[PDB]
Each structure stands twice: as structure tokens, then as C-alpha cells.
Amino acid sequence: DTNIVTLTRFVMEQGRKARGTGEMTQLLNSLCTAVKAISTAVRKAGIAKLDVLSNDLVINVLKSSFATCVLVTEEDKNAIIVEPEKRGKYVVCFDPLDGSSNIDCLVSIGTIFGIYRKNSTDEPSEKDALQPGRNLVAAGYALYGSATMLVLAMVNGVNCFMLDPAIGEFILVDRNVKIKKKGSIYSINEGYAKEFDPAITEYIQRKKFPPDNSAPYGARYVGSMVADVHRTLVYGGIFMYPANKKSPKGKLRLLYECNPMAYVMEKAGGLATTGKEAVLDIVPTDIHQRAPIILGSPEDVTELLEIYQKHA
Amino acid sequence: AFDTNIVTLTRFVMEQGRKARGTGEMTQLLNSLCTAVKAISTAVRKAGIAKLDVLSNDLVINVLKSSFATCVLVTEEDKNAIIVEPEKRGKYVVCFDPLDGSSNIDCLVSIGTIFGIYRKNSTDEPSEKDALQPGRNLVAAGYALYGSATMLVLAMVNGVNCFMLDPAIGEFILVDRNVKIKKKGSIYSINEGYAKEFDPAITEYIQRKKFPPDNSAPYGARYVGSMVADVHRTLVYGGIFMYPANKKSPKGKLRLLYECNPMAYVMEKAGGLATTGKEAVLDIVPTDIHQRAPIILGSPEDVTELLEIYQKHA
Amino acid sequence: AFDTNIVTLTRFVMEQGRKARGTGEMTQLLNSLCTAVKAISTAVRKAGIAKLDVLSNDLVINVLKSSFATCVLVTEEDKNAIIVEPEKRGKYVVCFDPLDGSSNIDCLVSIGTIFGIYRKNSTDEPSEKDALQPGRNLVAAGYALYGSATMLVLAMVNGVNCFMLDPAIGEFILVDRNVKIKKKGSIYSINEGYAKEFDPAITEYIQRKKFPPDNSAPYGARYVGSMVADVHRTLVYGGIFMYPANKKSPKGKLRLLYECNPMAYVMEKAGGLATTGKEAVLDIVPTDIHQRAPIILGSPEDVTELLEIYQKHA
Amino acid sequence: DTNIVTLTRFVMEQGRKARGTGEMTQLLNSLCTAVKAISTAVRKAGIAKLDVLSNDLVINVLKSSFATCVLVTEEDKNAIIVEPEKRGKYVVCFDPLDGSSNIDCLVSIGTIFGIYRKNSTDEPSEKDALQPGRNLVAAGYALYGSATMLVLAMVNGVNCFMLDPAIGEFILVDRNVKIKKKGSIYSINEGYAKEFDPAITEYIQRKKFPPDNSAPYGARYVGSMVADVHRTLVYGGIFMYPANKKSPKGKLRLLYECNPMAYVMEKAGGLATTGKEAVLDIVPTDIHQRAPIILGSPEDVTELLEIYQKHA
Ligand SMILES: O=P(O)(O)OC[C@@H]1O[C@H](COP(=O)(O)O)[C@@H](O)[C@@H]1O
Ligand SMILES: O=P(O)(O)OC[C@@H]1O[C@H](COP(=O)(O)O)[C@@H](O)[C@@H]1O
Ligand SMILES: O=P(O)(O)OC[C@@H]1O[C@H](COP(=O)(O)O)[C@@H](O)[C@@H]1O
Ligand SMILES: O=P(O)(O)OC[C@@H]1O[C@H](COP(=O)(O)O)[C@@H](O)[C@@H]1O
Ligand SMILES: [Zn+2]
Ligand SMILES: [Zn+2]
Ligand SMILES: [Zn+2]
Ligand SMILES: [Zn+2]
Ligand SMILES: [Zn+2]
Ligand SMILES: [Zn+2]
Ligand SMILES: [Zn+2]
Ligand SMILES: [Zn+2]
């Protein structure tokens, strides 16, 4: 196509508008070089581990960006402070590879990240990451499945880019995504049904055998956060992964799994709560703390929310 | 990278066609299915920067024919079996759904091409009828998976072998020889949306996995909602994937012929007796080319634990 | 994009192996050469972000063998012809240089795999000797070109067909059927660095192209310096490509057997009598598996204009 | 490789050093999106024209760069003035596809370009392009052959990048290229031998039968500027395309064929002249004017230069 709208052309132009520096574009642009290289590596996984390559690659591409200064990773005890020569204004929390275990089974998997603006004057620190999900600038995810695709969420909107493998570029394909209001799918790992605190099980039964003599919802759980959420985004529905007994505080870590998806959901018009408060409104204390999460088409989450405040 | 000695499926299955003198008719056929399988996957990867199931079907028909190894073909998305227009004939019946879950692409869920292949027992004319051999007289079955990778798993009589498309050269090279599914698992796989309609044998089965009666580990659940997704996970890692029957689809949704069946041969040939509930899926003399028939498959002990309940409530 | 009906060389040549009952042994063989040809090209494209000729040879040997269509193989970069280690036997002699101009990569010039294939006239044992059939008893010859595209041109007995690697699916699909070279051209192609050593027949030939005696157009010159470059340009557009003999290489540089020869069959089968100067290159009973023999090829009239001078200075 | 040095990472960092804007990086980066897309299109040319796609694509990618303001093309009568909303400080003269005719024959072909800095205060104009080749900021070429490869020439050096097709990124492979001093190859279209003005023919014979009882040079002419020059660069040698009688002013247009290669040659330590003056020192009057050119390993060009001033 002689006028393809890459991610870079899309980013740079909204950047043109904030009358800023060009760092987000450097950051995003470098980030996508990690994504292509990981997409490529997941598509030949096992022609002869991974998540450590995956982590190295994204830390390196982000350091060279000349735009970060604290990078928080799934795979690292402590957060990373970018040499002064390479610092810039962003904090990126990311899980490089989420659900790495799944590659054997051939499950769709992904990278997830969120970018905070360091607003403070002192030395880069763990504290610059301990900012509420509400404050995020940009957040999104990279998905590796039949097609590699990037949903990027910024203050103006949610957009899906798709990697064209011929030209190694991400092309803008669906614009200004908004979710279906109520939907027909519930997603939860039902093997913990003996654990689902009584709000959930209610809604589970209430949807399977709908006592309103309605069509039951279908259920789906691919078991890789990213495919479950992407699906919830496009076809509408609800995904849930709440505080159960193996996992009393949810499983999904906050700064890099729960707050990006959340941010993406609300920008798209979905909601995402814990059933006790908003995922994005939490004030993190630990960079690696976890969350119960429930996100998806607003009425369904509103439905499960009635039940949470109709059971205490 | 840059390897001098790689077992490409053509080279692989050919080391099978000649040592056992089984003409390598298998080859030509398969080779062509590899060109279709690949071409479809390219398209699915650029999917939304460019139906499909239709064009996918037409391309599989069309390439198959020219492999000179067919006489009968059966699709999901087709009428009476196609009898090969006649010059390009040979001995096989390929029955297949080229794009399983053809909706699911747009939600970026993984989808596949299945195939069942038979050899012609009739020395009469190709008639749609010939398609209708039952399971256990199948020469080769497998699938292709358009996922994070394009994996074709082939199950012939000696065993199931998984394969993977190396995009850099366009070959399905080999990564798992004589695949054997595990003996017992931790996954039950079923669409529990339909929990009203579920026959009390499966409801017991679910209740024993979820809540184990003997106080142990709950079986974790997992249902992608693509038939080819759920079998592969269930194959390589091991589980009970169950699309039984229920009022909403009273004799299953899965068109036995090229779905429950091709899968099942891949299942049993690695340790997985795929049942209906009453009869095993391969012994069911095929009544119609799109005749449907319910299916619970997977690794041996999980099947069994349900068949006991099946045997105790009828 | 997304085409339901594409003539992949396997499908193509197979529509040739069965209508003429010529066992499709041709196929298996070729198909395997396609997997080598491709794999090498991937590597050349990432060349300098990763010898080669060696590994290229080993991979071509190794894939060939498993096509079950060989008994004798001859390389540039090899000793006595390899006799196939014996289980994988069949009827053909493939003689080939896998990486022609193997230096030229680093200057990013285009390079290729040639091949000559024969069928075994001996009902005795595979002996290196069997390799040694002359040109005119060749069953199929062609080359592959690692250029801006990977183009394999195949010349069998019915004609030359050019092919092109669609990287998106890994097939050499077809773009030029029954290729015929032009009758006369505007290109003379020779390494005039060596203008000292040039035998007075070629020096006349050059002087008639450069300066046309009859006051007309100077023949434009073009010499890539890769044998596979110079033939393709000379084939599709038409010219006289001449690596004659001279003191520095007294009976040519091009190892007749798998170079001047495989090219020449592709030449004559599209209108191009490739000569030595004295005998035509296909009639020369092959004295040794790397026996060299000079070559002037191309379209008919240009060859002729030189053979007259060849016929008038001896 | 978990720390690949892309072109962007290389550019951006030398840009870090001029304490500038980031526009060259935008320009180069956008330019490479044209190159990938053209490489891809040349590699499937004829599975069923081109240079018009090729031109459109590069003009569009350059307009969106937010860094040009005059773009001069092989395929356009008049130069192009970039809408004010999208102007920035660079002038890029480019031939998008050089030797397009050749694709049938399967010849290695390429894009060529040169980037001037508009120094003046008034409205962008044709005159901002009429600047001596000596003034160029950056220049280089993209080559499409067995591998697609970008040689980029900037004030600090000549570097070869190579496109990795897996990840769609250009990787820095040979650094700070310098040519061999004298070399063994002469390149000229000898079919014009009845036209070669007496300096050339001398040197032609002087090299073929070397009267110094020396080894003759080999000759090569692929007939696509770009493959000939790339080869001259790496293996050393000389390429020549002088004023002949069909073409009394050379054939190769100045601003986009002769001055980029020239610039690349000298930065690499080669020379390039007309045999009457330096190619880069010419003051163009026409944006589309042509040149006799002779460039390559210094001694060889010095050799042919003796002869030019030993024959008048
Ligand atoms: O390493 P990750 O990113 O946490 O990957 C596994 C994750 O953990 C979840 C699994 O949770 P359950 O098995 O408890 O449902 C998946 O959905 C997520 O991808
Ligand atoms: O619609 P197709 O192409 O036949 O494939 C979809 C299949 O049909 C099933 C849908 O059934 P539920 O969503 O009711 O479980 C999926 O599980 C299978 O993949
Ligand atoms: O060295 P190889 O691999 O045999 O291939 C190079 C060939 O050898 C010739 C070299 O001869 P000159 O450079 O002397 O013309 C080339 O024209 C041919 O491609
Ligand atoms: O359209 P372009 O860029 O000018 O392409 C043809 C060019 O013109 C030259 C041909 O000149 P001669 O045929 O006169 O040698 C080639 O080397 C160049 O690529
Ligand atoms: Zn993870
Ligand atoms: Zn995670
Ligand atoms: Zn289907
Ligand atoms: Zn189906
Ligand atoms: Zn060689
Ligand atoms: Zn050779
Ligand atoms: Zn041009
Ligand atoms: Zn030009």
C-alpha cells in the first residue's frame, strides 16, 4: 500500500500534538524491535530459556531508547535504573513473556507494559513506579498468535496495530476500539470452583443456567492472560481472576499485568475492578504486588458488582 | 542455522513410503496438503490487513486433486463428496474441514485444517458412498494448527509425529517423533456454559474433577473454543477434552466424519481412546458425509474414569 | 493474494510425470532439490549477519540422497562421483555446482546452484563411470538464481520454464512457460580483461559487435561475472555470452560436466546452440567428472555469426 | 541477538552527539520503511509499474517524516514542496529505482538519495537543492540483491547495514568502511568503445594488456549503477561512465546518482571526478543535470587522471 500508517507514524503524530520531545516515539519504536524479535522467536520455538532472552531483549532496547529511567520487570527482583547517559522521562513496567510455560501447548502468549512519566525531581527510584494505574500515559500489549498484534492504549484511544511480516512494520488496522456493552462470555479458571468466594459462584450459576430464562453465556479460558483479554476486548464479555485460596491476592501482579489491561479496558469503555475497588485506583506499595481482577463489558462487570455488594 | 541434514516431512514420510513399498502415493498427496496448509496460515497471519474458509476450501480441493492421489473428497463446507474430475485420479478419500472455527480469527484465537484419509476399497466407480468407510479402516489422519507457530501433527499407523513450519524455508520440519500422550492429567476441557443440558454422567465427571471426592487437587480447566486448540493442548500435555452431546446439539456438534474422527485416530494412535460415550468413535459405521457424533477424548485414564460413570447410569 | 489455483513446480512437473507415465521419479528428486535450493538462498540473504559452498554442497548431497531417485552424484567441490550409499537408490545421476561464484556473495553479486540430471544406462553397479554420459542424453537440466528474487529455471525436454520463489509460502511458482530465447541480440558478454589471450576469431567477433563493420548499433556489453548471472540475462533478453578458452585456462575454466553442460541443455532447449567453438557442447563425450570445456552460448544467430569466423581461421 | 544494533540505534546515537532535533532519525527511519517495502516488492516482481509505486512510497514516507521540505525525484519534472504542517529541515534528492528495466533480467538494482540541510531563511525552493555535493550531510544507497543492504554515509564514516528479514530491521554489519587503495577491476560499458574519448581507451588498453608486463585487470559491468558501485566499494577497483556521444554529458544525473555515490566514495577514501573536476565540487544549476563520473580506489582514478592531463 503506498500510504501505510505504521505505529511510528501514528505515535509521532499524536506526539506532534503534545508539543513534546519525541521520547515516547523512541520508546515505542524500540519496544516494537523487541516485539518483532520475540514474535519471530516464538514462531520457531522448538526447531532444534525464552523468557530470559525475552527480558534481556526488552531491557536493552529500552535502555537504548534514550527515554526511560526506571524499568520494572516480571523477571527481576529489583527495578532497573538506567545509566544517566541513557536516561529520559519514562517508567516502563513490563512482563516480557507472559505465560511462557504455554509454548509447548502452543497457546497464544504476550508481552505487557505500562508507561509512567516520572514527575519528581530526585534520583530515579522504585518509588517512581509506585504510582496508581490511573496515572498511566500509555499502556498496551503485544500478542503472539496467528498474527502478531499490538493493542496500544493512549489518552486519546485504544488502537490495534498488526505486524506485517513482509515489511516488519506494524500497521494500524482497527481504530478507536470501544467494547460491546454487555456480552455473552464469562472467563474464569473454573478448576478453583471450590474456592470462588460467594459473589463469583453466584454469578457463575446465574449465567450458566440463567434463572431469567435466558441464553446461558458460553465460557472460555485460554489460560494465558493476554488471549483471554484480547478476546474480551473484541467480542465483549468478561474475564475474571479473583482472590482464590492458592492465590488469596489474585495471581496477576499489579504494575505490569493488572494495570495495563485495566487502563486498556476503561479507555475502551470496559471497566475493571477487584469487586472491592478499581484496579487502576490502587496505590501500590510494592512494585510486584498482585490483584484480584475482573474486567470486561461494563454491564457484566456491573452485574458481578451488584452481587459483590449484595453478599456482605 | 544452516543445517545440512533436516527431516522435512516429505523426506520423513518418504523414508516411510519406500521401506514398506506403500507406493509413496501418501507423499504426493500430503506434500500438496502441505502447500495448502502453509498458504492458508500466511493469509491468517496477515488476516486483518488484506470468506477465508471458503477460499481455504477451494484451495485445499484444488491442490488435492492435482496430487494424483485422490478419487473422493469430503469438506465441512460442501455438498455430496466431490468425486475427482476424472483424469487426476488415484486411490484416496480425503475428508477434511479446512478452517475450523473460521470466526475465531477475528478474536485471534488459534484455528486449524483437519484431514482424514482413506484408501479406496471399491474397485467400482468413485461414488460418494466410498467416502463412507469407518474410523478403524483409516490410513492416515492429522491436523494443522495456525497458532503462535504452524504446527502440523501427522498420525499414521506407526505413531503421531508433530511438525513445525520453519518460515525461513517453507518446510514443516519434525520436533516430536512417536508421540504418546500422558497417562493421566490435570485438565478437563468442556464448554460449561451449557451446564443445564449436561447429561448426569458428565456432570458427575465434572464434579469429581472440580471438587475431587477423595480430597486432592482440583483439575484445572481450559477451553480455547477451537477444536484444534483443545485437542493439541490435550494431546501434548494431556487431558479430557469433552464436547459431549446435549439437547442443544442432540448427537454432538462435531461432524464425525472429518472432525471427531480424524482427531480420534491421532488420539488413539498416541494412547487416547476417543469415545462417544457409548461406542468408540472409530467403530461407528459412517451414516452420512457430514454425519455428526459426540466426542470425549484424551489420555487413557481420564476417558476411562468417565466411561465407568457412563456404564453406571444407562 | 490468496489464490486457489497455483502451479507450484511439484504440481507442474507432476502434471508432466503422470501424463507421460515417466514415473514422477523426476518429482521426488526435484522436490528435494527445491528444499536445498531454498534453504541456501535464505542463508545467502542473511549472509553477512550469521564456507557456505561447502555446507551448501553437503546439504544438496544429503537431501538428494533421500529423494530415492539417485545412484550417482557429481559436485564441483568433490572427488570421484558419490555413489549413493546404497539403500536410497534409484535411477539418476545428478551432477551439480551448488555455489557458483561462492566469493561473489561478499560483493553482493548474484550466484546460483546448477544441476544436470541423467538417468542410469547401466544395469551394472553404480560406478563413477556411469556419471560420464554426454550432453544430448540428458533427461533434465536447470539452475537456481539467488538474486533480487530466487528464480529456478528448469529445462526439460518440452521446454524451459522459469520459476520464482514466493517467500510467503515457500514454493517456486511459475512465471514463464515454454521459454524461447530471442533470435538475435544487442549484448556480447565476455571478460575482456583477458583481451591479450583472445583467439583471433573472438577478437574479430568483439570488433564486429563494438564497432559494427556495417555502420549500425554497437552491441552493448554486460558481464556480471557469475556464470548464472550472465546466462539468465543472456537467456531472457538474449545475447552472446562467451567464456572461450585462452592460455590462462587452455580448455576453458567451466567444468563442462555440471557447468557448461547443464546450462547448454537449458540453452539449446530454448533456441541456443551452445558451442565450444569447434564441437557443440552436448556431443562431447565426457572424459572426466570435472572435465572442463570452453563455452560460447546464447541465441542462435549470435552463436552462428561467431561459428562462421570459427570456420574461417582454423 | 539480544543487543542488535539497528540503523535507528546507530543514527539516533550519532544524532545524540550533534545536540539536535531527532529529524535525521525520523527521515532515515521513514526512509527504511520505503526500502523494506520495495525490497519485498522487488523479490516477488512478477508473481501474477514498479518505479511509480516506488516513487510514491518514498515521497509519502518522507512527507510524514516531519523532517523534509524539498524532495527531488528522478521520476518528477519539478521538485516537491512539503506542506508547512509537515516541513522540517532536510532536502532529499533520491532516485527511487534505479535501473528498473533490469528486473526482467534479475539484475541487482537500488534506491539512491542525498540529504541537504536547507540553510536559508526563505520559502522552500528548487534552489535549496542546487547545492554542491560537497555540502551533503548524509547520503547512501539501498541495494536489492541476494540480500537487501543499506550503505549510509555520514560525516563520521561509511557503514553497511543489512536487512534482517525475520525482524524487518537493518542491522549494522560492516563498520567504517575504507576502500582498497589500488584495485584489480575496471568497469565501463565497453559497447561505447568507439566513443571513449582518448583518455579512457588509453587506460582501457593500458590495463587489459598492461605494457608494464603486469596482470591485466578483470572487467565487470553489471549495468545497474548501484551493483557496480557497491562492488567498487568493497572489492576496490574503478567504475567509469563518462561523457560518450549518445550521452555527451554522462548519463547519470547529478543530484541523485552522481553526488551520493561520490560522497560515499570519498568518505570511504575513494575519489570521484569527471576527469576535469570533482563530482562533489560542481555547482549545479539544474536539479536534473548529468555527469560524467569515474570513481573508485584512489590510485586507479589517479591513474586515469594522469592520462586525462597527459592528453591535452
Ligand atoms: O508468567 P505469567 O505471565 O503469569 O503467565 C501465566 C499467567 O497466569 C495465568 C494462569 O492462571 P491460572 O492457571 O491460575 O488460571 C495465565 O492466564 C497468565 O498468562
Ligand atoms: O465453527 P467450526 O468452524 O465448526 O469450528 C468451531 C468448533 O465449534 C465449537 C464451538 O462450540 P461451543 O462454542 O458451543 O463450545 C468449537 O469448540 C470448535 O472449534
Ligand atoms: O568460482 P566459481 O564458483 O566456479 O564461479 C565463478 C565462475 O568463474 C568465472 C570467473 O571468471 P573471470 O572472472 O575470469 O571472468 C565467473 O564468470 C563464473 O561465475
Ligand atoms: O533509471 P536508472 O537509474 O538510470 O537505471 C539505469 C542506469 O543507467 C545505466 C545504464 O547505462 P549504459 O547502459 O549506458 O551503460 C545503469 O548502470 C544505471 O542503473
Ligand atoms: Zn511471565
Ligand atoms: Zn505475568
Ligand atoms: Zn469450519
Ligand atoms: Zn467444523
Ligand atoms: Zn563453485
Ligand atoms: Zn564453478
Ligand atoms: Zn531510475
Ligand atoms: Zn537514476
Short mmCIF file of N, CA, C and O in Angstrom, two decimals, chain C residues 32 39 99 123 126 159 247-248 306 310:
data_model
loop_
_atom_site.label_atom_id
_atom_site.label_comp_id
_atom_site.label_asym_id
_atom_site.label_seq_id
_atom_site.Cartn_x
_atom_site.Cartn_y
_atom_site.Cartn_z
N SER C 32 13.16 -32.31 -3.66
CA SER C 32 14.26 -32.25 -2.72
C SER C 32 15.24 -31.18 -3.15
O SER C 32 15.74 -30.40 -2.33
N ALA C 39 16.71 -23.29 1.04
CA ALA C 39 17.47 -23.17 2.23
C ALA C 39 18.77 -22.43 2.03
O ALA C 39 19.09 -21.57 2.84
N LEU C 99 27.37 -23.66 -5.53
CA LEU C 99 27.56 -22.25 -5.23
C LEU C 99 28.85 -21.82 -5.88
O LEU C 99 30.04 -22.18 -5.50
N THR C 123 22.89 -51.26 -16.34
CA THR C 123 22.16 -52.18 -15.49
C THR C 123 23.23 -52.96 -14.71
O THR C 123 23.06 -54.12 -14.34
N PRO C 126 26.33 -48.91 -9.83
CA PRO C 126 26.78 -47.53 -9.77
C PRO C 126 28.30 -47.42 -9.64
O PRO C 126 28.94 -47.84 -8.67
N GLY C 159 10.57 -27.97 -22.95
CA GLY C 159 10.98 -26.59 -22.92
C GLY C 159 11.49 -26.13 -21.56
O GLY C 159 11.43 -26.86 -20.55
N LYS C 247 45.14 -19.08 -23.16
CA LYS C 247 46.27 -19.68 -22.40
C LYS C 247 45.99 -19.78 -20.91
O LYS C 247 46.16 -20.81 -20.27
N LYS C 248 45.49 -18.70 -20.31
CA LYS C 248 45.10 -18.73 -18.91
C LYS C 248 43.72 -19.37 -18.93
O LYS C 248 42.72 -18.68 -19.12
N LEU C 306 29.53 -15.97 -34.86
CA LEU C 306 30.87 -16.33 -34.45
C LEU C 306 31.31 -17.64 -35.10
O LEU C 306 32.45 -17.67 -35.55
N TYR C 310 34.77 -18.87 -36.77
CA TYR C 310 35.46 -20.07 -36.28
C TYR C 310 35.85 -21.08 -37.34
O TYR C 310 36.89 -21.74 -37.31
#
